[PDB]
Amino acid sequence: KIEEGKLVIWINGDKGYNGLAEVGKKFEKDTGIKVTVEHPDKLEEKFPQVAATGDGPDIIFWAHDRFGGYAQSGLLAEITPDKAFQDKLYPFTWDAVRYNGKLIAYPIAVEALSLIYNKDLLPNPPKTWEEIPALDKELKAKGKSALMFNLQEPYFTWPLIAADGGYAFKYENGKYDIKDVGVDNAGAKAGLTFLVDLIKNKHMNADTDYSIAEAAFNKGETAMTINGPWAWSNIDTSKVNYGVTVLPTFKGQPSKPFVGVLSAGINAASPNKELAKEFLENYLLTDEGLEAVNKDKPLGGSVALKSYEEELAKDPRIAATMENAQKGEIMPNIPQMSAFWYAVRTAVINAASGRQTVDEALKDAQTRITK
Ligand SMILES: OC[C@H]1O[C@H](O[C@H]2[C@H](O)[C@@H](O)[C@H](O)O[C@@H]2CO)[C@H](O)[C@@H](O)[C@@H]1O
């Protein structure tokens, strides 16, 4: 189920899990408890799978959109900070982790996608999606490409689909209408079609994934990429000269990334929910704990902790991150977010490889989600 006397932590691989072990150590030092940190693949899926059979990690880290689902199947545990603690953190971040009024996780940081470009290849980044194909033309005649980003994860294609009107679930009367989905509206269709046109006019590859795009950009073979703050760490090492800026517009409207709040929740069956409360409120959610994690891999634009946020809000990458977040939308945490991601993942993939037209693909997805 767990062990008792120890703390198992699960974090995704793209995150500062090493800086997280460091806080772990200081914890174990000050305390005496063994703190293990793992980062299994498909963590988001694996969790409930195990958390269910009464076992798994003590603490689970994921963006908040998955938390409502977990809370629903009962795998989480209600947390209980007090006006002392809660006040250290920005209000809207606490709101991101409330499932039916209740707090089911601790908010760490706001994540938003940004346009990352090679200042060597491109000193001036495009202002619009529309000029990318042309840019690619006169980059391709040099064994280079204009852009590559992960097309295998809907999170990365969402900003474009959402720019002209696509939407997940309509928000009405302080609640999401689960039957009013905008994955198959005019806006969503226009965004995807454009994407598909990029592929079909050989400006992009239907297969590009996280690794391929990371490598491509880090190696200097692509002028631009789309990713979050976690990625800066690795780019700092490739030593490519890069800027981080606002995603390009689509049909004159801003790209609208789905904004995630990195959060930490405690397993329903963690025998040491006490140890967990200690480590999360006392060691990690501190200027010192956040600095440890951040130095490993950038946390994001805005951190939940108001005082730490007092120092990291000056960087031009952080700033662009805050700009894109601003134009974006905080994700819902409702349990149906999982069906949404699954249906959308299939749609883009099917449309992009040509097994389905944009129309068939998005209709399928819309059906799947409201069924
Ligand atoms: O691609 C759908 C998934 O999108 C988000 O996942 C993000 C996550 O928020 C981010 O912190 C981690 O870096 O990148 C993944 C994208 O691969 C949602 O949080 C997931 O629930 C969705 O499945």
Curated annotation (Swiss-Prot):
One GO biological process term is: maltose transport
Q: Name one GO cellular component term.
A: outer membrane-bounded periplasmic space
Main location as per UniProt: periplasm
A Pfam cross-reference name: SBP_bac_1
Alphabetically ordered keywords of this record:
Periplasm, Signal, Sugar transport, Transport
The family database entries (InterPro entries) matched by this protein are listed as:
Maltose/Cyclodextrin-bd, SBP, SBP_1_CS
One GO term in the molecular function aspect is: carbohydrate transmembrane transporter activity
Q: Which domain of life is it from?
A: Bacteria
**Cell location:** Periplasm
Under the heading SUPFAM superfamilies, the entry gives: Periplasmic binding protein-like II (SSF53850)
Record function comment: Part of the ABC transporter complex MalEFGK involved in maltose/maltodextrin import. Binds maltose and higher maltodextrins.
Family designation: Belongs to the bacterial solute-binding protein 1 family.
Q: How does it assemble?
A: The complex is composed of two ATP-binding proteins (MalK), two transmembrane proteins (MalG and MalF) and a solute-binding protein (MalE).
What is the name listed in the Swiss-Prot or TrEMBL entry for this protein? Maltose/maltodextrin-binding periplasmic protein
Organism name: Escherichia coli O157:H7
